[PDB]
Amino acid sequence: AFAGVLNDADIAAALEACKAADSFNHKAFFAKVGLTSKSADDVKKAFAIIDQDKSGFIEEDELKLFLQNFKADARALTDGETKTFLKAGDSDGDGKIGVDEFTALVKA
Amino acid sequence: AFAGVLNDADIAAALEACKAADSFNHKAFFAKVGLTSKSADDVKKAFAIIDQDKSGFIEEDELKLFLQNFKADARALTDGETKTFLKAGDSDGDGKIGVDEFTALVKA
């Protein structure tokens, strides 16, 4: 879903680096794919794609499928990767990530 | 110190993927640099290099400098990366990593 608004090669390389189970690092991913340098406005767009059901939050089931928003055949994160990613982004502890949280996960 | 027993390109790419602060992932690193496919005997050799003082353990100060064993000018891990890496490898909770622990961190 980003393929048009993130570069093709950046995505591929991002995915290749975390093909092994439990090798995912969201900072590593974000930097490589090129989202860290994006505008808060484009980051919000990115957010909406990940939030598959448009609930206004990225729930754990959506975080598990994070990579698949980038390349449809990407692997699911393991439970440990998902919990780690959740824990880093979920500032208020509601077990989900809201747009402001997402923005801080991407940029900081 | 591995440059002769790990490939040049693998190391470079491993380092490039984690240049950003807090982007380090030991599984990602290990897989890319090529240590995961090594013999328990070569893994022990790797261990001895990281254990800079030959105490028989990789203490936290040595883990912080992990990358520098691969390329001398590599960055130090942040405190958060080091704690995470320590926590994943330190099975017995003595705050350091022994060779068997290291072996399981690399292979599993």
Query: What's the length of chain A?
Result: 108
- Experimental technique: X-ray
- Give the resolution in Å: 1.6
Report the residue from A21, A24, A28 with minimal CB separation from B18. A28
Region label for B58, one of left (φ > 0), alpha (ψ between -120 and 50) or beta (otherwise): beta
Residue of B22, B85, B78 whose CA lies nearest to B50: B85
Query: Which among B63, B92, B57 has a CA at the least distance from the CA of B80?
Result: B63
Residues in B 12-71 with any Cβ partner in A closer than 8 A: 17-18, 20-25, 27-28, 31-32
- Shortest alpha-carbon distance between residue A94 and chain B (Å): 23
> Tell me, what DSSP letter sits at residue A2?
-
Q: Residues of B with CB below 8 A from A14's CB?
A: none
Q: Taking the domain A1-108, which CATH number applies?
A: 1.10.238.10
Q: Using alpha carbons only, give the angle B95, B15, B20 rounded to the nearest 5 degrees.
A: 80
